[PDB]
Symmetry: D2
Subunit: 248 residues, 4 copies
Amino acid sequence: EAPAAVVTGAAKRIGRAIAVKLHQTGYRVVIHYHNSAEAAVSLADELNKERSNTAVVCQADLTNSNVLPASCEEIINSCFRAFGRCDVLVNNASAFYPTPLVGKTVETQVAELIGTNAIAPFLLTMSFAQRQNLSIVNLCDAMVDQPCMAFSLYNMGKHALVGLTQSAALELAPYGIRVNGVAPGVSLLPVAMGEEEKDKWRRKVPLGRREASAEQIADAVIFLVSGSAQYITGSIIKVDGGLSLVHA
Amino acid sequence: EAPAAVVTGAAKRIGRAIAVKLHQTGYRVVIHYHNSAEAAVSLADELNKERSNTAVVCQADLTNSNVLPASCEEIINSCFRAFGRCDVLVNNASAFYPTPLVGKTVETQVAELIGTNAIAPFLLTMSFAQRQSNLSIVNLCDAMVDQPCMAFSLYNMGKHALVGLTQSAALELAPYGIRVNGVAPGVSLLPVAMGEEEKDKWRRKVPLGRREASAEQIADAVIFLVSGSAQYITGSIIKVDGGLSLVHA
Amino acid sequence: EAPAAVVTGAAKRIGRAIAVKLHQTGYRVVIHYHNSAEAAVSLADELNKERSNTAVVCQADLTNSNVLPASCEEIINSCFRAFGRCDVLVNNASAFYPTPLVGKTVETQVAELIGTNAIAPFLLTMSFAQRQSNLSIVNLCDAMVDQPCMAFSLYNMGKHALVGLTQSAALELAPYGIRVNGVAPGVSLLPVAMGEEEKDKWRRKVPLGRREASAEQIADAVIFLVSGSAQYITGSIIKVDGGLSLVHA
Amino acid sequence: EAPAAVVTGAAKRIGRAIAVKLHQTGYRVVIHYHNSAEAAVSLADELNKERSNTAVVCQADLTNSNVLPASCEEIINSCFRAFGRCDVLVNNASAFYPTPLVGKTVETQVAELIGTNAIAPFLLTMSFAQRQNLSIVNLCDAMVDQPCMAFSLYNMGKHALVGLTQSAALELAPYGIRVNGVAPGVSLLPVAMGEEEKDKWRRKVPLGRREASAEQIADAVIFLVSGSAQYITGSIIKVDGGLSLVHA
Ligand SMILES: NC(=O)c1ccc[n+]([C@@H]2O[C@H](COP(=O)([O-])OP(=O)(O)OC[C@H]3O[C@@H](n4cnc5c(N)ncnc54)[C@H](OP(=O)(O)O)[C@@H]3O)[C@@H](O)[C@H]2O)c1
Ligand SMILES: NC(=O)c1ccc[n+]([C@@H]2O[C@H](COP(=O)([O-])OP(=O)(O)OC[C@H]3O[C@@H](n4cnc5c(N)ncnc54)[C@H](OP(=O)(O)O)[C@@H]3O)[C@@H](O)[C@H]2O)c1
Ligand SMILES: NC(=O)c1ccc[n+]([C@@H]2O[C@H](COP(=O)([O-])OP(=O)(O)OC[C@H]3O[C@@H](n4cnc5c(N)ncnc54)[C@H](OP(=O)(O)O)[C@@H]3O)[C@@H](O)[C@H]2O)c1
Ligand SMILES: NC(=O)c1ccc[n+]([C@@H]2O[C@H](COP(=O)([O-])OP(=O)(O)OC[C@H]3O[C@@H](n4cnc5c(N)ncnc54)[C@H](OP(=O)(O)O)[C@@H]3O)[C@@H](O)[C@H]2O)c1
Ligand SMILES: COc1ccc(CSc2cc(N)nc(N)n2)cc1
Ligand SMILES: COc1ccc(CSc2cc(N)nc(N)n2)cc1
Ligand SMILES: COc1ccc(CSc2cc(N)nc(N)n2)cc1
Ligand SMILES: COc1ccc(CSc2cc(N)nc(N)n2)cc1
């Protein structure tokens, strides 16, 4: 039987590309979502039209709370429910917005940014491991050491996620579970963002003066979960077209 | 007027060393504590006997909660209440224990490990800036963050977040003249519950001396980072590990 | 038409697995060697037996000297002479031996270690770029560069230099469509000379499988980096170390 | 009796600041120079005026060659002959210039950039140790991982120096010798650089929109060689005003 993968925030953009490429490679997928029900099912329909009963959806808020552990336990369960196995976990879901040091309460910002980018990936990892070419891939950020201004919580989240990638690689290696990361720089920009401000970020990218397509990010994910990366663990692959190498 | 510092978890060990050294340097100190009331009060006694009206104690739980912001805001408030100013903040307080991936609830482990090592520093940092000359923050990090102990995922994630904060905070608060730096022990004072055999196993790994760092040795680097000799230093983590992080498996 | 690749030190061990896998992927290969004449010619034969006119050998000493630029210019020239193009450069050749601080002269050690591991890669990158599709360079680095073996400073200085090259070359050659990246083994193929308890000592330390990387596992990452699945990857060093660099002392 | 320091390229700018602060701390100093004999001599006189017989100068080209090892052995030897001891070694001398990938020969650029920045520090280290609060301090570069364009050989030099620092810390720790680095970001700008170009770099620095004075860099070196840094080794202290944290 075909292996099975969980992709968090898989309904749109980069997570959608991961789930599609994983499916095109022959995985059965769990498309997690929070708000994008319509887009998630739409993706599942497309994938299932290709091969019947190879894509299911799963809803969960990934914000930190007393219920988070149980939601993450159940995302992993849905993969075992649908497919009888869970070979791959891609922690892609992420909140990202500014939290100046000098309207959500700060405690809610903590809950969303630290929960989605860090704690939920920790809890999903716990449940993944407990339930067992098994690997985990975490969507990190190649700009962590040169962070966006006023983004300290988000940024604290992605650093926490780098530490979890490393800790979990060390601890889960005895179980044959590899744990790795993929770090975009500028991939798909928010439709929210202004076009002028978009081309400002694009022009900074040495390799082609453009952003990464979502497929380019998914390519790194595909490599990491493959047989070609079977000695690779605790590694984080930058996919940033040299953006992080560029001084101020 | 003498400047004033806040040191979190300052009742004993390394935070005591920081507070004492900051006090010997001429600072007034808020000794923040959680459970260690007698040790906190004993230390504020010692320091006030040295210079009257120069040490207070301040109780707070730094576990993450929806009341954490308020608690951190009050820690900073207490320094202004006592001393009319707050020049320096040392984020020393830290919970530290295993959380294996395979009777505390996981929700509580998240709250204590992430709260003490990362969210309280963020919140204290926020409160410190908004209440505002040589202003600086020093975060107690960990030199072994990239070669972590087995099954310390949460603690390690919180120390990594602390590195992230140090950097983001240094960047954002530089315009306000606040510097933000770190001090990363490898092995310093070992746990009180640890047995001497297990301590010596760690001691024997340190290239420089085959011994742990003293609390004064850690405190020395913090005192450098707050001084006028570090006036251009920000976003920097100073490793104080006797070469331990260079030693391969 | 088939693209072509240069692999330094490709007669044996890891560079040989690299050249074999490039060739299976469809590349024509220049097999560079220094002393391993017999092995190099044997490899070209096997590759050519499989697909005709797809492999040449090229001899060069990559020790630093005033003629090293010319030699490196000639290794790149040999690919154009043989195949009409040069698409891929792999910097694999490396001297590796201890150089304690406290019968080769120090002048020679500096020359072999820094030349093979850094200066030759720099000069090759220069000639490659100047002679100029999916063009890319992969340098063979070392995952233990921050946790070096004792008394291996010149070697370690060379590997660090190689990281600096990867990044500086990635930045500068980006506007030319040339990507530059790295593959950093931990313990892979273990030395001929090394005793057998030393090998098992190193093997026990590897979290993932308690074994060293096969030559082919290292080559897989090189192959990924030069493929059309890495078109946005530049200035990245991929560890292929079974988690070894994560194990504390 | 008073301890003694060797400082390389100590005649001008940053190295001169380091020599002076060491001397003010109570060190006797070997002022090394290559071309700047008048400034070296000028410093030694100033310093000997303060304290009789506490400053000497010592000339040596630090470009890589087959005589380099002998030259570095003689710099160390000069401190022993003059003062009877060599407690501190500061590796400050640095060639710095572009070497684009696409009127010196390239082999000479290699020899100057790699020799001054990396090989001479390694030979000076060998000799320092062989001859024995003992410490070495290397002048590194905060911008090593975000290099200036077309500075690959310089950048290769500074990276090697980080590795030396680490390798030397580990190997000389049993002899009680600590090895550390100080990494400037933007410090003293070349005097002949136009103020308008100087200002483009200044403006990039978060902490105060200015470059570090030489004395500011010297301050960190002073720290590292003091009794206040006695457990510190293998460490590189950035002195950069937050410059390296600033994204493109
Ligand atoms: N795009 C870039 O340039 C870039 C750069 C650096 C790093 N990254 C990383 O790459 C990954 C994917 O990036 P992206 O731009 O595709 O992400 P994105 O659009 O910002 O977010 C992806 C998904 O995360 C889910 N999500 C947000 N908040 C959630 C919550 N509270 N609970 C559960 N799910 C939640 C959302 O799902 P729903 O719509 O279903 O609610 C969203 O569609 C992220 O980890 C990101 O941090 C991206
Ligand atoms: N010791 C080392 O070898 C070492 C190594 C690497 C890094 N570090 C770092 O250096 C720092 C100092 O080390 P240390 O060993 O002296 O620390 P520690 O004794 O383990 O902890 C210091 C203090 O943190 C406070 N704390 C714990 N949980 C708290 C909570 N929920 N709320 C508020 N305060 C809490 C405790 O205060 P109360 O007693 O008053 O309850 C404790 O006295 C820490 O940041 C540590 O991570 C130390
Ligand atoms: N093997 C590992 O565990 C390991 C670990 C970390 C990093 N690496 C890196 O991965 C690469 C491959 O490893 P490996 O073990 O296969 O390497 P290796 O066997 O030690 O050396 C590869 C080739 O380098 C060539 N070489 C040595 N000195 C030379 C010189 N002066 N001039 C020109 N060529 C010279 C030799 O060619 P000839 O035989 O023709 O003389 C040799 O076959 C190296 O870059 C190494 O640094 C390997
Ligand atoms: N200034 C900065 O913004 C900055 C930034 C980053 C890092 N740094 C680091 O801090 C250190 C000092 O910087 P700096 O600007 O003061 O230095 P600098 O002016 O560029 O040079 C320092 C001295 O190096 C000596 N030197 C140059 N080539 C030499 C050679 N072939 N042999 C022997 N000595 C040679 C020169 O001595 P003579 O004049 O006597 O010939 C020169 O005065 C360097 O290691 C540098 O890389 C500085
Ligand atoms: C720095 O300017 C940018 C670049 C990319 C984006 C894409 S939205 C996004 C980005 C991210 N790093 N994480 C998450 N979750 N979502 C937004 C602003
Ligand atoms: C590696 O084995 C050790 C070494 C030192 C200690 C000291 S207790 C401690 C340590 C820490 N990194 N953070 C906090 N908060 N407390 C415990 C276990
Ligand atoms: C002391 O531990 C080891 C580990 C691997 C080896 C393989 S031989 C080798 C290694 C290398 N880093 N570079 C080169 N060129 N060849 C030898 C000793
Ligand atoms: C921002 O562009 C600059 C900044 C400072 C300088 C001072 S000269 C210098 C610089 C250096 N890193 N190393 C050495 N040896 N010399 C020149 C250009």
